[PDB]
Design a protein around this ligand. Structure first.
Ligand SMILES: NC(=O)c1ccc[n+]([C@@H]2O[C@H](COP(=O)([O-])OP(=O)(O)OC[C@H]3O[C@@H](n4cnc5c(N)ncnc54)[C@H](O)[C@@H]3O)[C@@H](O)[C@H]2O)c1
Ligand SMILES: NC(=O)c1ccc[n+]([C@@H]2O[C@H](COP(=O)([O-])OP(=O)(O)OC[C@H]3O[C@@H](n4cnc5c(N)ncnc54)[C@H](O)[C@@H]3O)[C@@H](O)[C@H]2O)c1
Ligand SMILES: Cc1cn([C@H]2C[C@H](O)[C@@H](COP(=O)(O)OP(=O)(O)O[C@H]3O[C@H](CO)[C@@H](O)[C@H](O)[C@H]3O)O2)c(=O)[nH]c1=O
Ligand SMILES: Cc1cn([C@H]2C[C@H](O)[C@@H](COP(=O)(O)OP(=O)(O)O[C@H]3O[C@H](CO)[C@@H](O)[C@H](O)[C@H]3O)O2)c(=O)[nH]c1=O
Lengths: 322, 322
């Protein structure tokens, strides 16, 4: 079983690789694991340090946009788990082009090379942001694509490329959509690590707009497990939501973070709101529960405590990133 | 070290604050920075957006003419950097009164409150226009005050108030005089931003009179650094010229601007000359060089390229101002 994981040196991808190599996914035979990652500002070899010497791992410093490389690296690969992408909304508003280049064009190159290489199946990792914003209720897999940021539209375009590969060429590609993830090794440009590390440095927390925005949080371990279940038992062309359950306003979350670190509101700063900021995300995960048996297993309280502790203990890791 | 910067939401003042907070002036201890700005048509909170959440910054929306406010805000302040003023010659010709009110009366109120508050030192930001026009040669700090516009006479009157505060009350006030500044965040009523943004909008450039007027240009970063050197090491009551070196006719500069944007002379329009338009400005900066070590470090070609690019990339900022 040869598996290729793109974006495996990033936050979620590295967790997937680590778990896999650790044997957390018995149903996912992985005798050979190739990680393909271009090492952008978000890719970090340290994320794979724990599995560095594993004889089953091959690390490829390269790009999904590189057709030649792929045509070689995908030879005899049975499956691909695709996490490689530009992932930050803020960066997408500031410089949008890279998002279409990596997310849409990169996905197309990858999927065409998969077809050319006879790859058996692909799990295309996506996000709940393709659905825009939802005032009340939760989105299901049939919800409309109404992305509001360049990042979200790039992911949605990638999802559409995946569909077309399945419909035109018969490629067995499965799509997952998940809510905000959190956990160790998340880059500090993201909300939780940013705020936790800012407090660790005795700094302020830049709370966008009024902090009323709502996000659903899932520990990355749960997301990864959902992906492994889709990889092992999903169906060609299907979309699967992987949720975490827990919905919080950014204000609520900030309070929780402050509490966790013994800090107070005085460390918060109201800053201009993000342009086109999505008010609320909420996913319905009944499909994957009923069809594949997935449900989040890490409680926010526990997961969060552990994450904060991780940041406390790994300044050497995050400091250089800030 | 508590510092109060008036006019800190304007063009130059915001750059000074940003640089300071960024650590560009190691010799200027700034544990606490208060910015006092009345937010006239020229003051813009967006100019301080990048430093908004900095715990060392306190933004005070208020006026230098407000004695009561000052008497409170100057408590325990060690130094003041005074940039607040009405800065456009054209506006001064159209409605002169505000120039005496803000520039002269505002300075007097500020300096008297400084005395009442025991403020250690003040850097009064002034201009080369107090010297009138110079056909050949450059002005030194002993050059005569021969202002020709209501704006220039208001600045010169403010400089005289500063001298009197130093001579009568012992206030340690240092005066700086500089040439035309340019750079990001300059309000588009000024020559460069006006012409660059007009070209960006596909409009014409209103070239006053024959365009033969000569101006000396300095990037604001250099000016700010000169101010920081005077603040840290100048001497009470002294005047210091901060120059940029580069002298150009407005016609020459227009050509440079056109070139930079791929436009041509056809976009220019000869319009009536400004009343009492000063023919040429030229400052000698040997004093500050020999006494404080200052010399401009940003070459016009580089500085300008970057400025134009800034305007290209920040329509959202300037558009609302036009
Ligand atoms: N972070 C979340 O909360 C979340 C929620 C849902 C979905 N997702 C999706 O999960 C995936 C992983 O996100 P993440 O948070 O781990 O992202 P990340 O920003 O932590 O990491 C992205 C990784 O992809 C690599 N990469 C970027 N462009 C590349 C290219 N052209 N070729 C090869 N490698 C490239 C980077 O070097 C990096 O290691 C993304 O597709 C993202 O859209 C993320
Ligand atoms: N722009 C230049 O090329 C240049 C060259 C030499 C000297 N100067 C001097 O430098 C200083 C800064 O000029 P600038 O170009 O940044 O000006 P500007 O027009 O960009 O900004 C002036 C700022 O002062 C504030 N202000 C005006 N009146 C006020 C009042 N009564 N109380 C408080 N705040 C008030 C405004 O809100 C604004 O933020 C001025 O004193 C100007 O005379 C400018
Ligand atoms: C970075 C930052 C963020 N925020 C707010 C904006 C959002 O409402 C919320 C979370 O911000 P971010 O960490 O940037 O995450 P968000 O935009 O929700 O998107 C995340 O979750 C998405 C799934 O919802 C993933 O697809 C994205 O890749 C991932 O980055 O916190 C602040 O208030 N201040 C900040 O400094
Ligand atoms: C706005 C404008 C200006 N001009 C000319 C007039 C001047 O000769 C030259 C620069 O004009 P302004 O941008 O208004 O700048 P100027 O009067 O030289 O004064 C600037 O530099 C001064 C220092 O010299 C500062 O004290 C002033 O605050 C600052 O505004 O360009 C035009 O030909 N057309 C225009 O539309």
């Amino acid at each position: 079983m040869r598996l290729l994981v793109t974006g495996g040196a990033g936050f979620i991808g590295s967790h997937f690789v680590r778990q896999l190599l650790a044997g957390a996914y018995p149903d996912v035979p992985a005798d050979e694991v190739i990680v393909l990652d271009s090492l952008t500002y978000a890719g970090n070899r340290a994320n794979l340090a724990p599995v560095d010497a594993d004889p089953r791992l091959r690390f490829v410093h390269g790009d999904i946009r590189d057709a030649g490389l792929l045509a070689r690296e995908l030879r005899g690969v049975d499956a691909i788990v695709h996490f490689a992408a530009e992932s930050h909304v803020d960066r997408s508003i500031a410089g949008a082009s890279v998002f279409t280049e990596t997310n849409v064009q990169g996905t197309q190159t990858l999927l065409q090379c998969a077809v050319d290489a006879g790859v058996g199946r692909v799990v295309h990792v996506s996000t709940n942001q393709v659905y825009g914003s939802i005032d009340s209720g939760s989105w299901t897999e049939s919800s409309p694509l109404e992305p509001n940021s360049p990042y979200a539209a790039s992911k949605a375009g990638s999802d559409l490329v995946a569909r077309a590969y399945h419909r035109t060429y018969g490629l067995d590609v499965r799509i997952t959509r998940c809510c905000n993830n959190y956990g160790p090794y998340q880059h500090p440009e993201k909300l939780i690590p940013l705020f936790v590390t800012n407090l660790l440095d005795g700094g302020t927390l830049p709370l966008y707009g009024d902090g009323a925005n709502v996000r659903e949080w899932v520990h990355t371990d749960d997301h990864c497990r959902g992906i492994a279940l889709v990889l092992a038992g999903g169906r060609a062309g299907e979309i699967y939501h992987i949720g975490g359950g827990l919905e919080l306003t950014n204000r609520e979350l900030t309070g929780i973070l402050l509490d966790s670190l013994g800090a107070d509101w005085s460390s918060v700063r109201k800053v201009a709101d993000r342009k086109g900021h999505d008010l609320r995300y909420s996913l319905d995960g009944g499909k994957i529960e009923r069809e594949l048996g997935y449900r989040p297993q890490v409680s926010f309280a526990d997961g969060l405590a552990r994450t904060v502790r991780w940041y406390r203990e790994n300044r050497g890791w995050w400091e250089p990133l800030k």
